[PDB]
Design goal:
part of a larger assembly; 3 chains; A mainly beta; B mainly beta; C mainly beta; B: mainly beta; 6-stranded mixed sheet; 47% strand; C: mainly beta; binds 2-acetamido-2-deoxy-beta-D-glucopyranose
């Protein structure tokens, strides 16, 4: 309850950041992926094209605002919140199908195509994009270039392709691969025609599934670019660290292949801005703690608060910031030490003053 | 030419389960996303379901939707009917760059008993007569059910020309209110000895009469 | 959050041009990559889709409403407007400006619906006539009196009794279309017959679009 004259450390001063600006990309780009949706010709369902995408920035907004797709189905994730969510790999399964068979392509349905060509599992989180392009993949006289499977011995595992051309056996008598009795070919040609209606034209159906495993994000959606702020205690995340500090204008340039910068003490204190190739320094804001100057018990009641290594009645001393004690140019013998050759005392009403000590 | 077919009138007692359908004519119902909108009378519609099975944040869990793609019908299941559920239900589609809505469903619940329609008759005013106009006003109030048939009379001949009547509207005391107006010339008002308005309500007839005095 | 508020007149003449603008507060038209759409709803009928717009020049219109919908976006004022040509009497619908997050999906935010009425006449003031109670106007211990509002254009008209001091028993009826263009209604109040000759009853009919306020006193009928 009684405090004597001297410096007492009570707590620490923390400069909490007020803004959090994050900027990974600078612009938007995409790898050649639309070529499989705009190719000269497609593949059948017995042997469909399989595409893998790796290490490529890609947005799905362009693949939606075409205003030309007749149908669109994506389960597992909301269509408007899939870009910011990040996965590992995207599998593209492109094939052709008729107008009466787009109904059967859904998780949990039976039929003759969804069970014999491509089985959809219950935990199917992909998107199905289908549209009509009958003016290119069909021609007069009968377009029979596309194939599909009609017969199979038993069920097939999902995400499995079958290209077996063996003749399916219905009974117990072998046929030795002839067009005889009690056997039939499993592969049958399509019936595409440019003068068809709305339920038997060749539609292009693609499947965009996602991979979820113990791997970092490789191909997903980029981020937006916020405003650049400098000389303020602002938290940032420039591709390797969530650091809070001021961003001053540096005078040292980097080699044109580096992104980070460390020091002798091995602390990341320099990062190149991806927006304009600007080299910015990093310096922490919270420095030191606080101290209280007390004249003593039965002498005074007011106190002076000293900041240790913080840059700002108020006097900017060489040992931080001192508030609550006026500065006087004369010098006496000092009693309460502060540091850097300047002390504080209680003299003439009477108030706490700070002065350079006399030797 | 793709149109969504919806049941125009659907009624169910509170606490039970009812199913609202939405059938597509040409396009398959699993082709495009189906959105159900519950709109209060005199209020903006609000989205109560999206992606055909996902409930937006705020709506109760009971707004469950199912897709019967074989019959090309979209289904919306409601469990535990309440008072606030009485609203118009519309199902949405997209077809091909042309958003198509549904016919509409009126969730119903199953409060005034039969009430007699107090009838009042008013003759034309002298100020209206000085304006070369005349109007006979018949008032129908405090009645239930809200189905009243009016028939003006000129002494004994029924009057149909210039007759304007109002549809019954619910009052504050759970009853209904209505009116009938007979536009007339000042000469025709005094040509007949008397004019009368006859109100038929559930078989019973209440008649008032007025005369030029 | 964001909100959508419509403007423009609530009336339009037949074979004219409609001008309804929906303004945006709390958000940006160009930012976010979302769509705008206009949806109308006739009274007692289902919702009808008119058209949708982007912040660019992309537009798609209903096939039944094609070659008549003109919608433009002005990002400077942060609003978009819809222009309609050859409006008929069947175009009477409540216009809703709804924000659309997914082009094939839900209209998450709906603006409040402005009422649009198409009628063929000149805006005219109402004609208020007193409704005198008499012996034939009372059935029992209570009587009735009112005021007649005839030959006005447009809706709505408000009627108050004794400057709103009388509310019990007051019945304001919905308007009905007359044989020639205009509307007609009445507002009546049930009163005990003892205070017929001792209390003054004045109806206050107000017609804001024509800027006409009429106060008409109601007195018992005098035989002449
Ligand atoms: C990102 O794009 C902007 C605008 O095109 C450009 O100014 C900036 O230099 C780019 N940054 C890169 C390519 O790192
Ligand atoms: C395919 O090519 C056409 C014309 O070159 C183009 O308009 C379209 O956007 C491309 N992509 C798809 C998915 O149709
Ligand atoms: C303290 O900050 C002020 C303004 O931010 C600046 O003028 C002054 O030079 C700073 N003090 C030191 C020692 O850098
Ligand atoms: C102290 O005196 C010196 C003498 O020149 C003057 O420069 C300085 O401003 C004075 N300081 C105060 C706080 O009065």
């Amino acid at each position: 309850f009684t405090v004597e004259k001297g410096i007492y450390q009570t707590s620490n001063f923390r400069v909490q950041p007020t803004e959090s600006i994050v900027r990974f990309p600078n612009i938007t780009n995409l790898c050649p992926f639309g070529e499989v949706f705009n190719a000269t010709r497609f593949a059948s369902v017995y042997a469909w094209n399989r595409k893998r995408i790796s290490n490529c920035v890609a947005d799905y907004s362009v693949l939606y605002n075409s205003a030309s797709f007749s149908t669109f189905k994506c389960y597992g994730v909301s269509p408007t919140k899939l870009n910011d969510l990040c996965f590992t790999n995207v599998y593209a399964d492109s094939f052709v199908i008729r107008g009466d068979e787009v109904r059967q392509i859904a998780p949990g349905q039976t039929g003759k195509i969804a069970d014999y060509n491509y089985k959809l599992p219950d935990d199917f989180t992909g998107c199905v994009i289908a549209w009509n392009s009958n003016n290119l993949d069909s021609k007069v006289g009968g377009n029979y270039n596309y194939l599909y499977r009609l017969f199979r011995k038993s069920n097939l595992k999902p995400f499995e392709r079958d290209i077996s051309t063996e003749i399916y056996q219905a009974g117990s008598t072998p046929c030795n691969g002839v067009e005889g009795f009690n056997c039939y070919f499993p592969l049958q040609s399509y019936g595409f025609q440019p003068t068809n209606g709305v339920g038997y034209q060749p539609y292009r159906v693609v499947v965009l599934s996602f991979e979820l495993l113990h791997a970092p994000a490789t191909v997903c959606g980029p981020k937006k670019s916020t405003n650049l702020v400098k000389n303020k205690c602002v938290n940032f995340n420039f591709n390797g660290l969530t650091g809070t500090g001021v961003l001053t204008e540096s005078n040292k340039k980097f080699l044109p292949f580096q992104q980070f910068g460390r020091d002798i003490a091995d602390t990341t204190d320099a990062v190149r801005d991806p927006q304009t190739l600007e080299i910015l320094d990093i310096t922490p804001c919270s420095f030191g703690g606080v101290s209280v100057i007390t004249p003593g018990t039965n002498t005074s009641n007011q106190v002076a608060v000293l900041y240790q290594d913080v840059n700002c009645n108020v006097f900017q001393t060489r040992a931080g910031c001192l508030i609550g004690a006026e500065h006087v140019n004369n010098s006496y013998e000092c009693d309460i030490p502060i540091g850097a050759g300047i002390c504080a005392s209680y003299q003439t009403s009477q108030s706490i003053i700070a002065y350079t000590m006399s030797l | 030419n793709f149109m969504l077919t919806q049941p125009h009138s659907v009624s169910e007692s509170p606490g039970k389960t009812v199913t609202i359908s939405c059938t597509g004519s040409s396009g398959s119902i699993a082709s495009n996303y189906v959105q159900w909108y519950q709109q209060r009378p005199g209020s903006a519609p609000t989205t109560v379901i999206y992606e055909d099975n996902q409930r937006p944040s705020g709506v109760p869990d009971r707004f469950s939707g199912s897709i019967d793609s074989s019959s090309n019908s979209a289904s919306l299941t409601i469990s535990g009917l309440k008072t606030e559920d009485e609203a118009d239900y519309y199902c949405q589609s997209y077809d091909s760059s042309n958003v198509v809505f549904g016919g509409g469903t009126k969730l119903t619940v199953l409060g005034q008993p039969k009430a007699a329609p107090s009838v009042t008759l008013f003759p034309p005013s002298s100020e209206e007569l000085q304006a070369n106009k005349a109007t006979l006003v018949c008032l129908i109030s405090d009645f239930y059910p809200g189905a009243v048939t009016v028939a003006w009379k000129a002494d004994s001949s029924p009057v149909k020309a210039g007759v304007e009547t109002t549809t019954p509207s619910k009052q504050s005391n759970n009853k209904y209110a209505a009116s009938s107006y007979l536009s007339l010339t000042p000469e025709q008002w005094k040509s007949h000895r008397s004019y009368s308005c006859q109100v038929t309500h559930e078989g019973s007839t209440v008649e008032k009469t007025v005369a030029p005095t | 959050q964001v909100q959508l508020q419509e403007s423009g007149p609530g009336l339009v003449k037949p074979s004219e041009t409609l001008s309804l603008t929906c303004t945006v507060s709390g958000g940006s038209v160009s930012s976010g990559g979302y769509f705008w759409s206009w949806i109308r709803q006739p009274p007692g009928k289902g919702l009808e889709w008119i058209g949708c717009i982007y912040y660019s020049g992309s537009t798609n219109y209903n096939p039944s409403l094609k070659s008549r919908v003109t919608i433009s976006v002005d990002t400077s004022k942060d609003q978009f407007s819809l222009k309609l040509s050859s409006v008929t009497a069947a175009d009477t619908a409540v216009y809703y400006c709804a924000r659309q997050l997914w082009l094939r999906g839900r209209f998450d935010y709906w603006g409040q619906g402005t009422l649009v009425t198409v009628s063929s006449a000149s805006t005219k003031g109402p004609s208020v006539f007193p409704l005198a109670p008499s012996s034939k106007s009372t059935s029992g211990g209570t009587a009735a009196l009112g005021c007649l509002v005839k030959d006005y254009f447009p809706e709505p008209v408000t009627v108050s009794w004794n400057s709103g001091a009388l509310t019990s028993g007051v019945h304001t009826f919905p308007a009905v279309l007359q044989s020639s263009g205009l509307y007609s209604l009445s507002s009546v109040v049930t009163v005990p017959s003892s205070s017929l000759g001792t209390q003054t009853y004045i109806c206050n009919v107000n017609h804001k679009p024509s800027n006409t306020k009429v106060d008409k006193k109601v007195e018992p009928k005098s035989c002449d």
